[PDB]
Design a protein around this ligand. Structure first.
Ligand SMILES: NC(=O)C1=CN([C@@H]2O[C@H](COP(=O)(O)OP(=O)(O)OC[C@H]3O[C@@H](n4cnc5c(N)ncnc54)[C@H](OP(=O)(O)O)[C@@H]3O)[C@@H](O)[C@H]2O)CCC1
Ligand SMILES: NC(=O)C1=CN([C@@H]2O[C@H](COP(=O)(O)OP(=O)(O)OC[C@H]3O[C@@H](n4cnc5c(N)ncnc54)[C@H](OP(=O)(O)O)[C@@H]3O)[C@@H](O)[C@H]2O)CCC1
Ligand SMILES: Cc1cc2nc3c(=O)[nH]c(=O)nc-3n(C[C@H](O)[C@H](O)[C@H](O)COP(=O)(O)O)c2cc1C
Length: 365
């Protein structure tokens, strides 16, 4: 089973290639990491396995889900340290995903009920609704378009949060540049209607992600920085007219950062769409991004045991991250190794607040 051949991801000797994908679960009440998160990540940690946390706030304006953890305060750092410690005690590597939602927010999630920020004033359409704190679904509002100075202050929020993650003991951070969130609102030409230096051409649309990655690289070192993108995922009305071209343009900037800095990033992590031909066209897009990128490639999106084995065997990825199956299978790594049955997951408790129910009570083998 090639998922169980070891992989050297920079300094890290991973014993297998099954990665915990970042998953928002909304148990970090009032944005403070809770003891429940420690139990949840501990359950999933394995010796030599790699875990990526749920998206974590970089500032007070960065959230668009309830009870998502932050890492922008020293209080949040103290609580994250306890979780990192239990994960490291099991021999796992753990990165903190840094997440800003941009326009995918609501007055209820913003300080003083202010408008969310974006590259544009265009809102997400009414075909998508936002989960509210009371469990109902609400309307995405019109965001405020930010200027070049405010962009630099958002970049500084990423930098400070990356420093805080390292203070908490994380092995590194992942930049969430996917799924229609802030960075993707600058990348995708279906959203970014700017006429300044952050809009228009591929180079201008890639400016923001380049600036974010450069700032965190210069703060903590390229080896402790991964980057996640999703050029062909259309979530939250975030489409590009040419996803393969956009993806390659991002890869070009990442390769250039590495050459200029003198060091490789930890990895490029790409989520692909899954449609139920499209599967071959999408596989060729993924393989082309992998081939173009100078370093470690993590694939994600709809992977199963069989598809993960194929991705590694065929050279299409170095590591394979799993989301939904890892929600319901704390021992997913072992189940994949043994080709054991998998527990069904309960979508109704993906984003609820109970510290146990639908969170840590899915059974082991
Ligand atoms: N912070 C973030 O970055 C967030 C990322 N998210 C991403 O947003 C997108 C939309 O998420 P979703 O929960 O609204 O939809 P999705 O998980 O893709 O499934 C939509 C329907 O298609 C079903 N589906 C069963 N397999 C498949 C399959 N391979 N492919 C796409 N659909 C499938 C799927 O069945 P499940 O209940 O999950 O079994 C579901 O009923 C996804 O790409 C998701 O990964 C969630 C929100 C937080
Ligand atoms: N061990 C598992 O089953 C796992 C499922 N997983 C996912 O967990 C989620 C929860 O499962 P669910 O029962 O709540 O939803 P679903 O799998 O879509 O099936 C709903 C009902 O339709 C039934 N069903 C099933 N396949 C059919 C069919 N081809 N035609 C018609 N009816 C069908 C199915 O019967 P089974 O329990 O599978 O025997 C079930 O009663 C699903 O998204 C599932 O994809 C994770 C992987 C392992
Ligand atoms: C409940 C849930 C929450 C998620 N939260 C995040 C998130 O915080 N950050 C992110 O980059 N992706 C997030 N994702 C996307 C997953 O990381 C991953 O790409 C997707 O689940 C992989 O597909 P799979 O579920 O078929 O393995 C989330 C997915 C789900 C289902």
């Amino acid at each position: 089973n090639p998922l169980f051949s070891p992989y050297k991801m920079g300094k890290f000797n991973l014993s297998h290639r099954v990665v915990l994908a970042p998953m928002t679960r909304c148990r970090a009440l009032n944005n403070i990491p809770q003891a429940a998160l420690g139990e949840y990540y501990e359950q999933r940690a394995t010796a030599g396995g790699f875990l990526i946390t749920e998206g974590t706030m970089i500032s007070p304006t960065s959230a668009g889900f309830p009870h998502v953890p932050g890492i922008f305060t020293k209080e949040q750092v103290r609580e994250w340290k306890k979780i990192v410690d239990v994960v490291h005690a099991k021999g796992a590597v753990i990165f903190c995903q840094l997440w800003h939602v941009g326009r995918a927010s609501h007055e209820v999630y913003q300080p003083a009920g202010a408008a969310p920020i974006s590259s544009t004033e265009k809102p997400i359409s009414n075909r998508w609704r936002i989960l509210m704190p009371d469990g109902t679904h609400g309307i995405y509002p019109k965001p405020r378009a930010i200027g070049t100075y405010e962009i630099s202050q958002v970049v500084e929020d990423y930098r400070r949060s990356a420093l805080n993650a390292i203070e908490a003991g994380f092995d590194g951070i992942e930049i969430h540049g996917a799924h229609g969130y802030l960075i993707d609102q600058f990348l995708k030409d279906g959203i970014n209607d700017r006429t300044d230096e952050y809009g228009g051409s591929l180079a201008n649309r890639c400016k923001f992600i380049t600036q974010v990655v450069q700032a965190v690289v210069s703060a903590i070192g390229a080896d402790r920085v991964g980057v996640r993108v999703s050029p062909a995922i259309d979530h939250l009305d975030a489409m590009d007219s040419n996803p393969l071209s956009l993806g390659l343009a991002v890869v070009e900037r990442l390769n250039k950062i590495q050459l200029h800095s003198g060091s490789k990033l930890a990895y490029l992590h790409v989520t692909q769409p899954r449609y139920v031909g499209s599967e071959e066209e999408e596989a060729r897009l993924m393989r082309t991004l992998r081939n173009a990128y100078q370093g470690t490639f993590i694939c994600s999106g709809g992977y199963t045991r069989e598809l993960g084995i194929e991705a590694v065997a065929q050279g299409d990825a170095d590591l394979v991250s799993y989301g939904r199956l890892f929600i319901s299978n704390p021992d997913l790594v072992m189940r994949i190794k043994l080709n054991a049955p998998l527990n069904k997951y309960n979508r109704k408790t993906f984003y609820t607040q109970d510290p146990v129910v639908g969170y840590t009570d899915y059974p082991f083998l």
